[PDB]
Amino acid sequence: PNYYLYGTVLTRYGLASLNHDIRRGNKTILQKGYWNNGKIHSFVGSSAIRWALRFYLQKQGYLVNRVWDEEEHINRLTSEDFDPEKFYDDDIFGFALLPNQRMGALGMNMAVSLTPYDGAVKLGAKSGREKDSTSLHFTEYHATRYQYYFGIDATHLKDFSRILPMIDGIMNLPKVGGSSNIFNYPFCPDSLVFQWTNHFASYISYCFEYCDPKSKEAKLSQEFIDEVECGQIDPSKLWIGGTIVKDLQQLDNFESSPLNKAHIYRNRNEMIEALKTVIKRDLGL
Amino acid sequence: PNYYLYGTVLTRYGLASLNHDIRRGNKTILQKGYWNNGKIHSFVGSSAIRWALRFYLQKQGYLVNRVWDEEEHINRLTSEDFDPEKFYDDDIFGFALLPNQRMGALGMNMAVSLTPYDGAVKLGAKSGREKDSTSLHFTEYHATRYQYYFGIDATHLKDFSRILPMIDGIMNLPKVGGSSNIFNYPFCPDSLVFQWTNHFASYISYCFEYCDPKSKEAKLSQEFIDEVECGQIDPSKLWIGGTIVKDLQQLDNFESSPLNKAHIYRNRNEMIEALKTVIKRDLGL
Amino acid sequence: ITSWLYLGGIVRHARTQNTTKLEEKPEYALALLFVPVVCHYCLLHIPSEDLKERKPHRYLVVIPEIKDFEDASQRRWRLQQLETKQFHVSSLGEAGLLYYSLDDIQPEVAYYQACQVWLYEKTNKASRQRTLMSIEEIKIDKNILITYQQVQKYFKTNYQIIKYKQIFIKVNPIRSLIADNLVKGIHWWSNFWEKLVIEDSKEYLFNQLFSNREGFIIMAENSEEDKQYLIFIKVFQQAMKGNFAKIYAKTEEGKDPPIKKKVERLRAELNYCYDELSFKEYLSDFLVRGGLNKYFNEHQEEIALLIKKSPWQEIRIWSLLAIASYKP
Amino acid sequence: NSEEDKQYLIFIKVFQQAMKGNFAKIYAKTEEGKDPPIKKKVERLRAELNYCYDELSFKEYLSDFLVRGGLNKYFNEHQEEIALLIKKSPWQEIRIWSLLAIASYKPKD
Amino acid sequence: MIAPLILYLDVPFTTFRESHAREMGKTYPVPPPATVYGMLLSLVGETNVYRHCGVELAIAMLSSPKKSRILRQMRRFKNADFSHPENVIPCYQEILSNLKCLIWVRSDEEKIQPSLRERIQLAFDHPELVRRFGCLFLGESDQLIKTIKLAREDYLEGVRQWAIRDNRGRLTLPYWVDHVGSRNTRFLRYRIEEMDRLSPPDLAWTMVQSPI
């Protein structure tokens, strides 16, 4: 009996220059690409969020094969023969080699800035009477919210109890690799759309969408609501939590809409407790 | 454990021109960008506040690897090799010379203007009938309260006792890089929202909003209060002090809201003393 | 085979060099031997980097899609005629268009050519060898190519600065900007002023604007949406004509009227305006002082709505263009 | 176009009709001489409009000019809309609108 | 002849970086038949690759996606030591955004029962019965699929961009991928033709076979 847990999570509003890409002498370009309507949005690589989860798992017990030496800023590997039955990271994120391999039990898309990117940069000349090179750096930044989508096959896990630490990690995501010195951007969720179903396909990949450039309302996308009303994407398996709950409860006719009978909580921790109880009951933990 | 300190700080009201960007023609544009509601706001960079903290640590008598010669306006290195064990600035702010690098405990974000920037400008001209190309000039200024977000990792500090001087410096921040001759803008805090928790998730980033688009009112944001109501962000781990305390105490039903059972102090020094006592108890100092 | 034969065919995992190596039939291996002859090579100049302080080292490789052997041979032999100073470009699309610049244009035949541009650039200062940093596809139709020829004709060519063994080449950024927008399919006038003035305080390409302002106007004329702003340009030109007539009337006999000084004052006053209210105040006052304007009478509602709706920065930009484009 | 743009257009036309009335009165009153002053009258009108320093004085001058104009067909067809537009909108924006109407005055052929 | 099964695909981000592009993550405009075949095998939980040879696949591309480049510190097997900096290399990889396409599956050429079409159908009627692992993805593992559902020819009732086998086309899509080297990889030359049809034209039925 396969069981999955998909989720679309939207972060807060803040100033971010997280991932970046190769510089051009001047400027540290935040990487970006096209999105809905062709407007350019700033991205955050999937490997970034996977690295953040690995760091979270390493920071709180939860034995990790791929330990990150903070002092040396390098990745040391404890046991060259990966053992998913023991190491959490090989159980979840998998591994690769020249047994032979193990597909990661976690797959997440790259994070997307909810609002299109406008040309924004930060001057960076370093203090000092002497003005030599390596001064006047430019840091392209973005004042938006980041929304990313993940999916885990809990069945593929070697230890079925490892789903819960991933839930705590995604809720308390420590840090996506970024200019924390200049732009400390928290990545904790502000509005969640979770679904725990035995179906392989979940049509909730990117449900937070507002556009409306330079704004933070972050309404639920119309297409997601239409899909919910259609009959598919069963509301009983839906879990809606965060600040979007307020806007949902301020929607007209919401008391009679099919979205009403979905698990809905303003408090994020109550959502997490209820979902974890359901998952533990279904998986027999 | 893993304790962290997060806070959003609001400054007093005054005329500020602290972050002139690359000037055009005769006018010295101060750096600005978009923010809430799509209105242009003036930004003061986080590197400026990091420099101010470095200067505070230098002045108070702590080691500080980077010495700033005020008369020479130059920066000198006490030792070519960074030693985070011995130097406070290397411990906190990190380094990268290009071991070799440190992550850095203090993670600070930009200083946004609470009030949108209308475009006010000031003309300055050299006196005397003898007039040359450098005779007259225009300097852009803004009358606003500034708000920035910072986050530090107590565990990441090589010496845990170093968290006290950084807090003292934040509450007694020296001049932030700007134009003190004609726009002397004090950056001293007048309203704090501090969180000292073991979880990372932070919901106090930019929790301040204006009552009127052109005013010095500085009320607490609705999202922060609502999130405290809903159940997350435990009031026992909340620390609010400053001028916003009066507005919070004048709110209706305040004695029944969860805001009541949170650490609130009218005097900022008392709240800082209490938070410092809590930190010293938690980290065994 | 190896990367020297097929560009981009490096072995990702060196420890598996014997097994994970690209394999091909002998005839295709011969083709991979003889690829270098067809593809041309161009040098890329970073606009942000001063060419004086940085000699060009990025190499763009233009590889054309093949439709016929004879057509490709004739095209390559034609492109052999061009000067090296042309090959120095400021964008990948510029090099791609240059590869198809000498192609004959036939109005009965639907022209369509495709080529690949492969960017090779050292990752760092001390990089021993170049690495493939960008591949971009260019599909050129009739309209794009004729527009590019029009841009080449109106806009100035590269300045072949020559110094101590230093034959620097000054590429016009605008040409590239237009070319890029053309390839994008978006309006050429995406944001020329931004690049010409806002970004180009140094007037590196702003001078090109001065040299090619007519060309800019020409393309703007092509732009239908510009129409309203063209009518506003005529309105402001008529208003400044009236103001200059008033100054001429005020001018004493024998004295030289300071029309140049008045124009400089106009530019300074317009640049001084800091918000919507002050700029609109000054614009309306200047229009009133101009006198009876025929154009503003004919297009009353349209110009009024344009003033009411357009952001004041844009109206200031077009007013500055009107001042610069004034020609009695 | 939105409603505000329509109101702004009616205000422009109202001001233009008021200027029509005032110029007609000027022509009728000073028919003697080679030509009555209109260009000087337009310059004086602009100077008076720019003289106004706050909402009270500017609104006083605007209302006085409007009544001096005479019957105002554009101001006939729309009473409440234009009246509310005048009372509510900031006086500076009214000054821009009046100056634009001045510059847009189509002479009667 | 039983109507071929039709699937509606919607992937937010995807990358089908071409084979010979090993220095760069430069991708095909269209999902190759091999990647689609592998993803269908993953959906039906079929680990063996030789089980469903002969199934014919046709792809209808609903909207042309945008191509964007992203930077990645991809890890490679260059040095024996894992911690050696030679393993990590910074390089660019192209992605395709907002990819919506329709897939036609014709399993009549299969010689082993049940065919792939029957397996996909039975999977969609009874999602709980099918036993598999992993999370469904197109291209790279982290690029999940927003929506894969059973749909008709009229789901968008719009205009379709088909991938047609043309001996003078531009795209060189592989229908069988040899992951180790390039010996067994088999290529077919395609083109994108804009036609208003609710059913694939013959050629579109790219039929997957073993390289032998």
Coordinates of N, CA and C in Angstrom, one line a residue, chain E residues 41-114:
Chain E
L41 N 7.2 3.6 -17.2 CA 7.6 2.5 -16.4 C 7.6 2.7 -14.9
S42 N 8.1 3.9 -14.5 CA 8.0 4.3 -13.1 C 6.6 4.4 -12.6
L43 N 5.7 5.0 -13.4 CA 4.3 5.1 -13.0 C 3.7 3.7 -12.8
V44 N 3.9 2.8 -13.7 CA 3.4 1.4 -13.6 C 4.3 0.5 -12.7
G45 N 5.3 1.1 -12.1 CA 6.2 0.3 -11.2 C 6.9 -0.9 -11.9
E46 N 7.5 -0.6 -13.0 CA 8.2 -1.7 -13.8 C 9.6 -1.4 -13.8
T47 N 10.4 -2.1 -13.0 CA 11.8 -1.9 -12.9 C 12.6 -2.3 -14.1
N48 N 12.2 -3.5 -14.7 CA 12.8 -4.0 -15.9 C 12.5 -3.1 -17.1
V49 N 13.5 -2.8 -17.9 CA 13.3 -1.9 -19.0 C 12.9 -2.7 -20.3
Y50 N 13.3 -4.0 -20.4 CA 12.9 -4.8 -21.6 C 11.5 -5.4 -21.5
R51 N 10.8 -5.1 -20.4 CA 9.4 -5.7 -20.3 C 8.5 -5.2 -21.4
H52 N 8.5 -3.9 -21.7 CA 7.6 -3.2 -22.5 C 8.2 -2.6 -23.8
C53 N 9.0 -3.3 -24.4 CA 9.5 -2.9 -25.7 C 8.4 -3.0 -26.8
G54 N 8.4 -2.1 -27.7 CA 7.4 -2.1 -28.8 C 6.3 -1.1 -28.6
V55 N 6.1 -0.6 -27.4 CA 5.0 0.4 -27.2 C 5.3 1.7 -28.0
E56 N 4.3 2.2 -28.7 CA 4.4 3.4 -29.6 C 3.9 4.6 -28.8
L57 N 4.7 5.6 -28.7 CA 4.4 6.8 -28.0 C 4.4 8.0 -28.9
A58 N 3.4 8.9 -28.8 CA 3.3 10.1 -29.5 C 3.0 11.2 -28.5
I59 N 3.7 12.4 -28.7 CA 3.7 13.5 -27.8 C 3.1 14.7 -28.5
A60 N 2.1 15.3 -27.9 CA 1.5 16.5 -28.4 C 1.8 17.6 -27.3
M61 N 2.5 18.7 -27.8 CA 3.0 19.7 -26.9 C 2.0 20.9 -26.9
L62 N 1.4 21.1 -25.8 CA 0.3 22.1 -25.7 C 0.8 23.5 -25.8
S63 N 1.9 23.8 -25.1 CA 2.4 25.2 -25.1 C 3.9 25.1 -25.2
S64 N 4.5 25.9 -26.0 CA 6.0 26.0 -26.1 C 6.6 26.6 -24.9
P65 N 7.5 25.9 -24.2 CA 8.0 26.4 -22.9 C 9.2 27.3 -23.1
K66 N 9.5 28.0 -22.1 CA 10.7 28.9 -22.1 C 11.9 28.2 -21.6
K67 N 13.0 28.5 -22.1 CA 14.3 27.8 -21.8 C 15.1 28.8 -20.9
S68 N 15.5 28.3 -19.7 CA 16.2 29.1 -18.7 C 17.4 28.3 -18.2
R69 N 18.5 29.0 -17.9 CA 19.7 28.4 -17.4 C 19.9 28.6 -15.9
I70 N 20.3 27.6 -15.2 CA 20.6 27.7 -13.8 C 21.9 27.1 -13.5
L71 N 22.5 27.6 -12.4 CA 23.8 27.1 -12.0 C 23.7 26.0 -10.9
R72 N 24.6 25.0 -11.0 CA 24.6 23.9 -10.1 C 26.0 23.5 -9.8
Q73 N 26.3 23.2 -8.5 CA 27.6 22.6 -8.2 C 27.5 21.1 -8.2
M74 N 27.3 20.6 -9.4 CA 27.2 19.2 -9.7 C 28.4 18.4 -9.2
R75 N 28.2 17.2 -8.7 CA 29.3 16.4 -8.2 C 29.6 15.3 -9.2
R76 N 30.9 15.1 -9.4 CA 31.4 14.1 -10.4 C 32.4 13.2 -9.8
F77 N 32.6 12.0 -10.4 CA 33.5 11.0 -9.9 C 34.9 11.1 -10.6
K78 N 35.6 12.2 -10.1 CA 36.9 12.4 -10.7 C 38.1 11.9 -9.8
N79 N 37.9 12.1 -8.5 CA 39.0 11.7 -7.6 C 38.4 10.6 -6.6
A80 N 39.3 9.7 -6.2 CA 38.9 8.6 -5.3 C 38.3 9.2 -4.0
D81 N 39.0 10.2 -3.4 CA 38.5 10.8 -2.2 C 37.2 11.6 -2.4
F82 N 36.2 11.4 -1.6 CA 35.0 12.1 -1.7 C 35.1 13.5 -1.4
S83 N 35.9 13.8 -0.4 CA 36.0 15.2 0.1 C 37.0 16.1 -0.7
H84 N 37.6 15.5 -1.7 CA 38.5 16.2 -2.6 C 37.7 17.3 -3.4
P85 N 38.2 18.5 -3.4 CA 37.5 19.6 -4.2 C 37.3 19.3 -5.7
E86 N 38.1 18.4 -6.2 CA 38.0 18.1 -7.7 C 36.6 17.5 -8.0
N87 N 35.9 16.9 -7.1 CA 34.6 16.3 -7.3 C 33.6 17.4 -7.7
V88 N 33.5 18.5 -6.9 CA 32.5 19.5 -7.2 C 33.0 20.4 -8.3
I89 N 32.1 20.6 -9.3 CA 32.3 21.4 -10.4 C 31.1 22.3 -10.7
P90 N 31.3 23.6 -10.9 CA 30.2 24.5 -11.2 C 29.9 24.5 -12.7
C91 N 28.7 24.2 -13.1 CA 28.3 24.3 -14.5 C 26.8 24.6 -14.6
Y92 N 26.4 25.0 -15.8 CA 25.1 25.5 -16.1 C 24.2 24.3 -16.6
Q93 N 23.0 24.4 -16.2 CA 22.0 23.4 -16.7 C 20.7 24.1 -17.1
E94 N 20.2 23.8 -18.3 CA 19.0 24.4 -18.9 C 17.8 23.7 -18.4
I95 N 16.7 24.4 -18.1 CA 15.5 23.8 -17.7 C 14.3 24.3 -18.6
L96 N 13.2 23.6 -18.6 CA 12.0 24.0 -19.3 C 10.9 24.2 -18.3
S97 N 10.3 25.4 -18.4 CA 9.3 25.8 -17.4 C 7.9 25.8 -17.9
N98 N 7.0 25.3 -17.1 CA 5.6 25.3 -17.4 C 5.3 24.4 -18.7
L99 N 5.8 23.2 -18.6 CA 5.6 22.2 -19.7 C 4.3 21.5 -19.6
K100 N 3.4 21.7 -20.6 CA 2.1 21.0 -20.6 C 2.1 20.3 -22.0
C101 N 1.9 19.0 -21.9 CA 1.9 18.1 -23.1 C 0.9 17.0 -22.9
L102 N 0.5 16.4 -24.0 CA -0.4 15.2 -24.0 C 0.3 14.0 -24.6
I103 N 0.1 12.9 -24.1 CA 0.9 11.7 -24.5 C -0.1 10.6 -25.0
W104 N 0.1 10.1 -26.2 CA -0.6 9.0 -26.7 C 0.2 7.7 -26.6
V105 N -0.4 6.6 -26.0 CA 0.2 5.4 -25.8 C -0.5 4.3 -26.6
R106 N 0.2 3.6 -27.5 CA -0.3 2.6 -28.3 C 0.6 1.3 -28.1
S107 N 0.1 0.4 -27.3 CA 0.8 -0.8 -26.9 C 0.4 -2.1 -27.7
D108 N -0.1 -1.9 -28.9 CA -0.5 -3.0 -29.7 C 0.6 -3.9 -30.2
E109 N 1.8 -3.2 -30.4 CA 3.0 -4.0 -30.9 C 3.6 -4.8 -29.8
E110 N 3.2 -4.6 -28.5 CA 3.8 -5.4 -27.4 C 3.4 -6.9 -27.6
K111 N 4.4 -7.8 -27.3 CA 4.2 -9.2 -27.4 C 4.0 -9.9 -26.0
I112 N 4.0 -9.1 -25.0 CA 3.9 -9.6 -23.6 C 2.7 -9.0 -22.9
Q113 N 1.8 -9.9 -22.4 CA 0.6 -9.4 -21.7 C 0.8 -9.3 -20.2
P114 N 0.2 -8.3 -19.5 CA -0.6 -7.2 -20.0 C 0.3 -6.1 -20.6

